[PDB]
Design brief:
Chain A: It comes from Homo sapiens. Chain A: This is 26S proteasome non-ATPase regulatory subunit 14. Chain A: Belongs to the peptidase M67A family. PSMD14 subfamily. This is part of a larger assembly, with chains A and B. Chain A contains two helices and no strands. By secondary structure, chain A is an all-alpha fold. By secondary structure, chain B is mainly alpha-helical. Chain B has six helices and no strands. The chains are: A mainly alpha, B mainly alpha. Chains A and B meet through loops of A and helix 6 of B.
Chain lengths: 48, 152
Amino acid sequence: NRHYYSITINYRKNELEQKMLLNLHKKSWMEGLTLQDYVVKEMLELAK
Amino acid sequence: LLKLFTTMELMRWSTLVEDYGMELRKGSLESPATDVFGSTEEGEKRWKDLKNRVVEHNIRIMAKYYTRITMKRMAQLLDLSVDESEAFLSNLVVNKTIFAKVDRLAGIINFQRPKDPNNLLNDWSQKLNSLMSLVNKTTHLIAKEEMIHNLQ
């Protein structure tokens, strides 16, 4: 507390990048072109 | 020989008699014919080992179109009888090289695979092969689309 008081750190209204991070994030983190899974049944054998 | 090694091209065995027997009608080297087919109780076994070739290797070329054949057609394709067919069926089933199952309720039988042994494999093979093809499709249809729409 002596010699130091902290400064405040907020994170910007970043929609100019948060927009495109969200859009690439969910347009990519599910099967890319999203026609990939649409593995199906022997995983069900092990799972059952 | 080598054309008879790739799909074996279901020739006439008397044209094999032509080829492999007029080697004794050579006004040159007959020491190939003398060493290979000049033998009698080894060379005759080579003649019938080549009948074993026609049955052996031509069952391995005909193994595609089965899961449906009668026995008379297999006699009409193996270039031999039905009795020679059954003797060769005997020695190649005790070979048991590819899983045979032969039966005479009416005779519709064949040398065969293990006879589609699985369940959902058909869904896997057909639908996932064809549909993962159809998911690679759009990924290179955009390829074709961009490359042709650079110009027009």
